[PDB]
Enzyme design. Structure first.
Site, short mmCIF file in Angstrom:
data_model
loop_
_atom_site.label_atom_id
_atom_site.label_comp_id
_atom_site.label_asym_id
_atom_site.label_seq_id
_atom_site.Cartn_x
_atom_site.Cartn_y
_atom_site.Cartn_z
N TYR A 60 33.29 70.75 47.67
CA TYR A 60 34.44 71.67 47.66
C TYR A 60 34.57 72.37 46.31
CZ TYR A 60 39.06 73.28 49.35
OH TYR A 60 40.11 74.04 49.78
N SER A 130 29.90 65.29 48.05
CA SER A 130 31.31 65.33 48.44
C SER A 130 31.41 65.89 49.85
CB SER A 130 32.09 66.09 47.36
OG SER A 130 33.48 66.12 47.63
N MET A 131 32.03 67.05 50.07
CA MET A 131 32.07 67.63 51.41
C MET A 131 30.67 68.01 51.91
SD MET A 131 35.59 69.80 51.58
CE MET A 131 37.21 69.05 51.42
N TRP A 155 32.48 62.57 51.31
CA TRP A 155 33.74 62.50 52.03
C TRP A 155 33.57 63.25 53.34
CZ3 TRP A 155 36.84 65.97 54.41
CH2 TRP A 155 38.06 65.47 54.92
N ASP A 176 35.46 56.99 41.07
CA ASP A 176 35.74 58.17 41.89
C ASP A 176 37.17 58.14 42.41
OD1 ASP A 176 35.84 60.23 43.91
OD2 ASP A 176 33.67 60.02 44.27
N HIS A 208 33.67 61.17 40.41
CA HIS A 208 33.24 61.95 41.55
C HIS A 208 32.15 62.95 41.19
CE1 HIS A 208 33.65 63.32 45.61
NE2 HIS A 208 33.92 64.56 45.25
#
Ligand code: LI
Length: 259
Positions: A60, A130-131, A155, A176, A208
């Site tokens: 993101y 992440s995304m 995620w 994170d 993260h």
């Protein structure tokens, strides 16, 4: 015996160096060239062999610059890698799953003759931060033909990926706070069955964003996972099984070893 082996016999120091043994070239993918993703850059080995192909998505608000180092470093070990920008920086995981699929098809069908000819299109992998890491999971769930998936500090809305059969390496970060491993990476890891090839690697002293700068552990075990499963290269089994010690950069390691 194994026709897909590339590069010299691996060692710790070889996998830890900032650059692997293959010299690499780049191919720019313009946004106008990219259908269904934001463009990016293809890193490929100059040596005239066929290699697996890997697509890596950022997270993101993230750009391809956030994952560039990892694309070139993995390529430098014997792979064709595209690091992408996404359509918008705010795209969510399932949209990134689509763009990762778009990135793979661009490399195989849309890139120049010099890149396409270096690809064995039957051996593909996806990776994501992440995304983008949830994108890798979602497309892996949809594309069990893929040979590897490496979600980095991933995620996704959904943490139950038990339907995935692609060999998957989850990398998490102990500090994170944005996709805490307690609620995301470790629930994702534990959702995969014991019957598939998987591993969990938690970085020590890591936020993260540790995937977004050169990291010798991420580089080493990413390459090791891709070698074992994209290339079937059992020379790399020994790095993954039993896998990294703690006590020092690795906080925790689980796996379905033996592979
Ligand atoms: Li720690």
């Amino acid at each position: 015996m194994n026709p897909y082996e590339r590069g010299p016999n691996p060692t710790d120091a070889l996998l830890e160096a900032r650059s692997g043994p293959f010299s690499v070239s780049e191919e720019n993918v313009s946004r106008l060239s990219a259908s269904g993703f934001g463009g990016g850059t293809i890193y490929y080995p100059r040596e005239n062999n066929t290699y697996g192909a890997v697509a890596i998505s950022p997270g993101y608000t993230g750009t391809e610059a956030s994952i560039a180092w990892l694309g070139e470093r993995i390529a430098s070990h014997g792979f064709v890698v595209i690091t992408i920008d996404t359509i918008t920086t705010l795209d969510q995981p399932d949209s990134r799953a689509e763009q990762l699929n778009a990135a793979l098809n661009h490399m195989i069908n849309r890139a120049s003759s010099t890149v396409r000819s270096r690809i064995d299109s039957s051996r593909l992998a996806v990776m994501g931060h992440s995304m983008g890491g949830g994108g890798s999971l979602r497309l892996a769930s949809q594309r069990p033909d893929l040979k590897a998936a490496i979600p980095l500090t991933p995620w996704h809305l959904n943490k139950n990926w038990s339907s995935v059969t692609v060999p998957t390496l989850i990398i998490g970060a102990d500090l994170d706070t944005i996709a805490p491993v307690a609620t995301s990476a470790k629930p994702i890891y534990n959702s995969l069955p014991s019957s598939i090839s998987k591993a969990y690697l938690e970085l020590d002293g890591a936020t993260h964003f540790a995937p977004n700068i050169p990291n010798k552990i991420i580089g080493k075990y990413s390459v090791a996972w891709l070698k074992r499963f994209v290339d079937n290269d059992t020379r790399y089994t020994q790095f993954l099984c039993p896998g990294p010690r703690d006590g020092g950069e690795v906080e925790e390691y689980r796996s379905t070893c033996p592979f």
